């Protein structure tokens, strides 16, 4: 029923605020300069990166840096998933599976919140790394971020806000089709309810946005391709770029993924 769906929506938004210190609302305030605090330092080149590195080749340092933020974000997304009603009651192996396949799809979703067509906010929004600088990195590191920018620009054109994203994220995590799930049904049941809540949310929050719900569901599938490309890039690096490892948590997520 409607009231329950709105209370679900609100519960998810509150959880999202409690789990993610840097929201899309805050990010956009920063990117548009409608905030009181200092403009972020721009990293647009090598020595610009040097000065910011305050506040081992360049491409590796960036890639190592990404990992620390990635594992921090994994921790945030896990804490959020544990606030989705029904989730902690699932068989624990299924929670692991849900998390393993879902986590980077969520990372890239939320990273779009910190992106515009010119670059990405880093270190809690205090830095801005241009898309051009990241594209400048040597093969194969310069190919990492570009598909995410391409997704983010189109994703951001939907103009979802944090309240929309909280449900969107929950729907993705509760995907009944992840490989190797033990008990698909109780996952689909929870997801069905979250989808109902999302449909109602988009209708009330964006009454005039044509086929928004259908557009959103499509993006969920587009995210898998983004993760696919990232993973194949990591496999290249594993095979051919050997002096620098992957954080143990990330190795665990990626091991036997698909």
């Amino acid at each position: 029923e409607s009231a329950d769906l709105r209370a679900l929506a609100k519960h998810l938004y509150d959880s999202y605020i409690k789990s993610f210190p840097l929201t899309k609302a805050k990010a956009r305030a920063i990117l548009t300069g409608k905030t009181t605090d200092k403009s972020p330092f721009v990293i647009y080149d090598m020595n610009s990166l040097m000065m910011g590195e305050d506040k081992k080749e360049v491409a590796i340092r960036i890639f190592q840096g990404c990992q620390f933020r990635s594992v921090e974000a994994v921790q945030e997304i896990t804490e959020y998933a544990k606030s989705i009603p029904g989730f902690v009651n699932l068989d624990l192996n299924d929670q692991v599976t849900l998390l393993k396949y879902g986590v980077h799809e969520i990372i890239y979703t939320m990273l779009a919140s910190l992106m515009n067509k010119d670059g990405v906010l880093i270190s809690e929004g205090q830095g801005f790394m241009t898309r051009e600088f990241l594209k400048s990195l040597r093969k194969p590191f310069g190919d990492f971020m570009e598909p995410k920018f391409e997704f983010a620009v189109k994703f951001n054109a939907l103009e979802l806000d944090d309240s929309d994203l909280a449900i969107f994220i929950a729907v993705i995590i509760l995907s009944g089709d992840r490989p190797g799930l033990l008990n698909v049904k109780p996952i689909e049941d929870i997801q069905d309810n979250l989808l109902q809540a999302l449909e109602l949310q988009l209708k009330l929050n964006h009454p005039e946005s044509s086929q928004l719900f259908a557009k959103l569901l499509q993006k969920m599938t587009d995210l898998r391709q983004i993760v696919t490309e990232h993973v194949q890039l990591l496999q290249v690096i594993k095979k051919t770029e050997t002096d620098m490892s992957l954080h143990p948590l990330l190795q665990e997520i990626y091991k036997d993924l698909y």
Partner: peptide
């Protein structure tokens, strides 16, 4: 394993 720790933490 590390995922289990994160998941069951309170």
């Amino acid at each position: 394993h590390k995922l289990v720790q994160l998941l069951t933490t309170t």
